[PDB]
Write a protein that binds this ligand. Structure first.
Ligand SMILES: O=[N+]([O-])c1ccccc1
Ligand SMILES: O=[N+]([O-])c1ccccc1
Ligand SMILES: O=[N+]([O-])c1ccccc1
Ligand code: FES
Ligand code: FES
Ligand code: FES
Ligand SMILES: [Fe+3]
Ligand SMILES: [Fe+3]
Ligand SMILES: [Fe+3]
Ligand code: NI
Ligand code: NI
Ligand code: NI
Ligand code: NI
Ligand code: NI
Ligand code: NI
Lengths: 437, 194, 194, 194, 437, 437
């Protein structure tokens, strides 16, 4: 696994999107040790509320506790290993296994065991048979993440320099809500194909989505045919130590939405931008109403503006269960919230007319990584290479001066390679000591 | 015919009423007429005549909606958050956009030309009891989509429609609703007109 | 129309006779009536109104039978042991039991609610030549069952039915027979009403 | 109804004309008659009465054709080499050969007996405007073939037929054309009568 | 493979129900060396009769010889390896390969070779090209088993202490008949999930099948909801050296059958019990009309009373071809035999309303064993642990005083682990020297 | 992999048709180093014409250059690895990637890069990013082959002694045309099952195809039931150093075609035979109008007379994408050409009534090679063994005196084993030094 990504994350072996054994290895490194998106406060707002989430290939029950905290547990009975919960979301103070009737609390404790008195007696210690708990649960402004590795950095540290870019929308806008339920569909591509596309693929928009731009008249029509850069400027792209990165297209608050969404959305964003400029400054207030496309390492992606939140849930090396949520700013009028929720699915949900374009990009890349000769071809992530900066006065992290660029691909794959070559967090840190230099 | 929802524990009040509607609404002439209508509509879609479909078969006031329902416990009362995501929820302009995207020569996914085959069955129709120009229509659809040598996707759906008679003799779709039966379709996408 | 089973070497005497029955029994009015009957029956089952189906569509004397036929050599005469196992062979009480099991709130398999979609085609009907209240009915069924996010099973069957006209105008099932075409279904189970 | 092929960019001139043919050719009586015809034909094939099908349902002048179309770019004009391979292109004698092969006791593939189930839908018919004894028929078919315990193949097709009325009242197939929708079927073979 | 099952068979790694490489290893140990169920005399009663059976993943032709014996052969032509027979059962004195026409006798001998004289001459020795024979074929009261390993213990020894429990129904009742054909269906679970359920899962009946108990009013309604033990007592569970084991629920001759079967079946069983008490004693005559649920190691299971015979035929690590037969006592009236045959399928056949309940138990357990984090969870087999006895005056083998218990799970998994850690029968025996202590 | 085939290619382990790891190994040896069939001149006759072909599991674009030559390239973009071309055939002077818009010439050169001036500058070297080219492209009388290994022998040398047998039809008949498009269908068998059948299975025709012979009255009816050899004689079979081989059935120019094709075809062939006898001699002119069934190592097969050309494209160890073309002699009347094209599909295309017979031969052989016990059974290739000759005055190569024979199986599997045991062409040559002795 040592040389699947080259120095500076410049090239990647195509095999990474198709190799079966590497997928197994990712479960052990990538998904076993990194922060993985679970849910938002707004989807489990009341005590007893739960959702069923994936963490890599495993499934967890994510539950709002009676004291207001959140705990998550592997969705597996401690008796014979039956799956415990089959609903995708609900409210319950306990979960009963349908096999023999063991009853657990929403806190994971084994509370009731049929025939305990008559047949078990002291042959059972319920304290030792609680659901297997996810040891790390942290949030970023309502967005809840889990981690199987107790040694992981705090979520905020893990977000690194990416957090600064997220804050105008996620922190300073007055709170977001995640609108459920998500769209779900299975796509025959590797999880990394989606992750790299969302982390920094401004380059594909004008070409892959040429027809959708013409039809819907998205603000992205400016880059149609990859003929001209946006009149607003090339934008930015950034990356960070732990692999998260994103592009910024200035001012494009309506993102991949069609013309019918533009006037009302732009009016709402311009109005809050003026308020925000006074609190956080002109540049950051502009970021608030700009289009950010990014990936929170490894497999959680987002768009701001055309507000989407994605999880690329791995099934196997060429199969991914794609989740699509919309998010809204809490103080949007309720009609606008509903319109945004439908517009997200309309572009990038299971029946989205943009995302349908992407299938063949993702799927054939992944399927080519399985083929003997083709798998030895390198992918190149050279756009903007040699022009990235670190320690810029205005923009933190490793930063390129174009959202049409591969700065964030390079950082994503750098972090990826460091993890697959490492046995633990200490080794990752050693492998990342000079990540920006 | 009436369903007793107290004894028939699996039946929703919505489905029970609707069954009754279509039972008492049976009319032989209407059945033949609507069967012809849906066969024509499906043929038009199969040959990818999306503009002709949108102009001649779809009314300006169209609501074209396909939902995916989150799986909830049959006994879990308290959790009241929205249980449906709109895979489609389109007005006329939004369908126009999707149709344009379909016929653009730079729609890369449409090259080579995709093959569609639609199977429409179990047609049931009833005139609305208030608005007699409105026809309630239920029909089941199998849609086979083939492309790129070995890609095959099969979709299965019940379309719950309202159609409207037009001055001159035409009949146009004013609402289509589909509660898509597979929560996570294994079909790459659902970019098909059900 | 008659089949010559001496020349048509693949045709069973049973199937040949039965084809003739349905050929000469064709009646336009009956075809429409039975098509409506089977569409109603399938709708009722799709919305899981099993009690209403058993009470209103199924006669007290019902025999509801689905067999799986052991694969035998077309030329192996001597072996005479029973070649059919009854996956279903139910009287009314046995259907009642199965229906009760379906609607019990402690049927864990039914939570979250399963989705059924039935496609009925190729309807053919003939009045019995002796008992004119008896209607012989043949129809083909595709049944799609979806649950638990990514479980999908599709069943394919020909239902060979006898239905009976009831005083008052109803029509009730007195026999359904299905020779299930896949010897080893790859559908987890066959716990569906075909 | 007419399709504007300048605006409807995905529609072939062939498909547009053909849609119009069947739209204006609608006749309620004919629809019922042809539906019965195709149901009978499918039943006969399902019970493997191939000789009876060839004698009674197929005309001496039959052309029975199923093509597989090479996938070409929607914009690639210059390349003019034949784009269709004939999986079937049979006259009466060639069908006779295939039928004989089917019923030979030494056809090893037919033992144990294969199971066929055909689902015919979306029937549309129109009398020819010149030759009124000729009936143009379009119908969609799902064909399920099961054998050898766990082999299952499902075929999906649109049959574009010309049928001819015979002195005495019969109706016989003079042409069947199928443009098979999957370029590379994943069904082991296509040795079925569509 | 060394520590997949803990001491005393107390715990099992969930991974055992999902691991691909372990499945391959089972073919080499478990299915290559143990006794596997083939058929009953009653299904091949006449010379030339044959059935096609699975032995692990392989297929064999099981044939009644002209001299009345039974031989079985791999269903593979010795020329180019085509499958020889495609019918599931029949009568034939020979089998001809459809590829080139080689003809074998029902005794496996290569008898005819087209063009032998003209083209082969002495380039062929037919004596060397007979079908590959199963070297060990033995029966237990008409039930015929095969074994690929010539070094296996005699079938009767292999049944060990389990045979005593089987004899009232299998030996002393006047003969059984297996009613064919079996129900067959594919279920997405590991073969072991079914095997452990039938070997001793009295615990699941009252919970998993609560709805079916209410609907059909089986005698098992007594344990509905796992609220109360049977009024007859807790019953028994036993296990044996080579892994076979079973539970006994006293008096429950009608088993999982509904109320419409109870009066006639109970009357028949009570009548023979009275006769049998004089020949074999009160206790054993009561066993005759009790419900036994068991597994004959590795993958053949049975229920007495609601008389069923099952084979869990492995396809892969998460796929099993499930066979379901009924059996009857030969002297039952023919109408009762037919009613029993249908009732078995009605409860546990492909459309059985009980067995349908079980799918999600079996399937999710198996699918959880494939998932990275979940596969490291232990299944626990602790019910009755510390209270099993050996060398009891009345009941042989290792015996627990409840059919709701995990005595037989522990013995099943003990034998399983001994086999996967062993290269041959000698090594298994060494690993099993103190099996009961 | 060392002893999968025995000395003289006499026996093969059945496992070779089912083993997953061996398939992976074949991609590295067999498909990475041997000549693989691409297309015919007649399918890419004009500059810019292309077809999409498989080379093992990889896909290539095979393109007619402006200067009249042919080059082929992996169908994979050098940027992020998306598949480049989706049409099966066409005409184009360039290929544009639908992902980001990179444009390549029909010569594989990277010609255009969107935003090159604005965003790439000197960060891109287009000369280094041309499509990955197939390094060896050669033809045999219009039939174009490719090879991934630059060290391969010239195609003509690779055909070895087989070329002499092919020349009457392929060289001396005045040119052939390949009629497209091919039939394509997926069959659940290993690629080798088809390859061995076509390389020399005269033995199966009379048995497998008994019903088809009776129905169509092919000239092969002479060998129906494997009862009698052809009245013309037993025919010939040959094999060669690099594995290609074939059988010859004298005079059978109409091959597997039915009676309606026989008179017109026989008249055409007899007429040219008389002309050819003057140029190439009686024997070779007779070969011209004889039926040859063969395989051009590894996975390209053909029939002359009933003129077919086949590619067994591997998908995995039990899955093959079967391509079927007809070929015609260029000077046949156009109606006869059309009749031949349909007749090929009628017998052996996706709906062919002969080839349908073969499915169960191929598929069950392959599926038996996956099964644990059955996979250890040997296939035997002994027909004609001990009677083959080398250096015959009239017939070159290793030659047996019957087309119902296994001479060519033995040579095919000898070459196969030499390749799987070798790391390169030099090692193959060393392993093949005494191939005929
Ligand atoms: O607009 N988009 O949908 C989009 C834009 C950039 C990267 C990924 C997706
Ligand atoms: O009654 N049953 O069906 C049953 C009882 C115990 C174990 C397995 C099955
Ligand atoms: O005639 N055939 O189709 C044929 C003959 C020999 C080998 C393979 C195929
Ligand atoms: S597996 Fe959950 S209670 Fe037994
Ligand atoms: S493979 Fe059986 S006779 Fe050749
Ligand atoms: S992958 Fe082809 S241009 Fe980017
Ligand atoms: Fe995109
Ligand atoms: Fe159970
Ligand atoms: Fe053949
Ligand atoms: Ni409704
Ligand atoms: Ni118009
Ligand atoms: Ni019948
Ligand atoms: Ni009622
Ligand atoms: Ni047409
Ligand atoms: Ni006739």
């Amino acid at each position: 696994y040592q040389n699947l990504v080259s120095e500076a994350g410049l090239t990647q072996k195509l095999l990474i999107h198709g190799d079966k054994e590497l997928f197994q290895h990712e479960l052990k490194t990538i998904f076993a040790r990194n922060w993985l998106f679970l849910t938002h406060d707004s989807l489990i707002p009341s005590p007893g509320d739960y959702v069923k989430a994936k963490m890599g290939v495993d499934e967890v029950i994510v539950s709002r506790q009676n004291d207001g905290s959140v705990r998550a547990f592997l969705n597996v009975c401690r008796h014979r290993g039956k799956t415990l919960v089959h609903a995708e979301a609900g409210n319950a103070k306990g979960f009963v296994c349908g096999y023999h009737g063991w009853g657990y609390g929403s806190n994971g404790e084994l509370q009731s065991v049929p025939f305990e008195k008559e047949l078990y007696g002291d042959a059972i210690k319920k304290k030792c048979l609680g659901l297997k708990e996810v040891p790390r649960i942290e949030s970023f402004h309502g967005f809840i993440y889990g981690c199987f590795d107790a040694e992981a950095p705090p979520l905020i540290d893990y977000l690194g320099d990416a957090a600064w870019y997220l804050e105008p929308t996620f922190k300073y806008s007055g709170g977001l809500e995640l609108v459920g339920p998500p769209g779900k569909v299975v796509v025959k591509a590797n999880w990394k194909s989606f992750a790299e596309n969302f982390v920094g693929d401004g380059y594909h928009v004008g070409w892959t989505h040429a027809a959708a731009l013409r039809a819907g008249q998205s603000v992205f029509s400016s880059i149609a045919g990859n003929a001209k850069l946006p009149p607003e400027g090339a934008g930015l792209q950034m990356t960070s130590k732990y692999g998260s990165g994103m592009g910024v297209f200035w001012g494009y608050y309506s993102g991949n939405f069609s013309a019918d969404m533009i006037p009302d959305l732009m009016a709402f964003g311009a109005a809050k931008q003026e308020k925000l400029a006074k609190e956080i400054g002109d540049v950051r207030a502009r970021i608030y109403r700009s289009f950010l496309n990014g990936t929170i390492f490894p497999n959680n992606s987002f768009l701001t503006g055309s507000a989407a939140f994605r999880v690329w849930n791995p099934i196997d090396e060429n199969t991914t269960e794609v989740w699509t949520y919309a998010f809204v700013e809490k103080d949007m009028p309720e009609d606008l919230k509903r319109r945004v929720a439908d517009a997200v699915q309309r572009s990038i949900g299971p029946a989205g007319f943009w995302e349908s374009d992407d299938n063949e990009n993702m799927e054939t890349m992944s399927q080519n990584g399985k083929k003997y000769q083709s798998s030895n071809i390198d992918q190149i992530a050279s756009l903007g290479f040699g022009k990235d900066v670190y320690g810029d006065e205005c923009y933190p992290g490793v930063v390129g001066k174009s959202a049409i660029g591969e700065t964030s691909y390079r950082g994503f794959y750098r972090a990826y390679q460091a993890h697959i070559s490492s046995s633990n967090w200490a080794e990752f840190e050693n492998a990342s000591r000079n990540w920006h230099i | 015919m009436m369903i007793n929802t107290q004894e028939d524990k699996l039946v929703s009040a919505h489905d029970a009423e609707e069954f009754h509607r279509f039972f008492v609404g049976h009319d032989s002439d209407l059945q033949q007429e609507v069967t012809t209508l849906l066969t024509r509509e499906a043929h038009l879609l199969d040959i990818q005549a999306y503009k002709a479909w949108l102009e001649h078969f779809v009314a300006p006031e169209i609501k074209y909606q396909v939902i995916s329902r989150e799986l909830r416990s049959t006994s879990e009362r308290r959790y009241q958050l929205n249980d449906a995501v709109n895979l489609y929820n389109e007005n006329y302009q939004q369908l126009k956009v999707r149709v344009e995207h379909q016929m653009d020569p730079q729609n890369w996914a449409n090259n080579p030309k995709i093959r569609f085959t639609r199977f429409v069955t179990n047609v049931t129709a009833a005139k609305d009891k208030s608005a007699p120009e409105i026809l309630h229509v239920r029909s089941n659809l199998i849609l086979h989509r083939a492309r790129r040598e070995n890609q095959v996707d099969v979709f299965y759906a019940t379309r719950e429609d309202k159609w409207k008679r037009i001055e001159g003799g035409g009949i146009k779709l004013v609402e289509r609703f589909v509660d898509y039966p597979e929560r996570i379709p294994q079909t790459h996408n659902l970019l098909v007109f059900l």
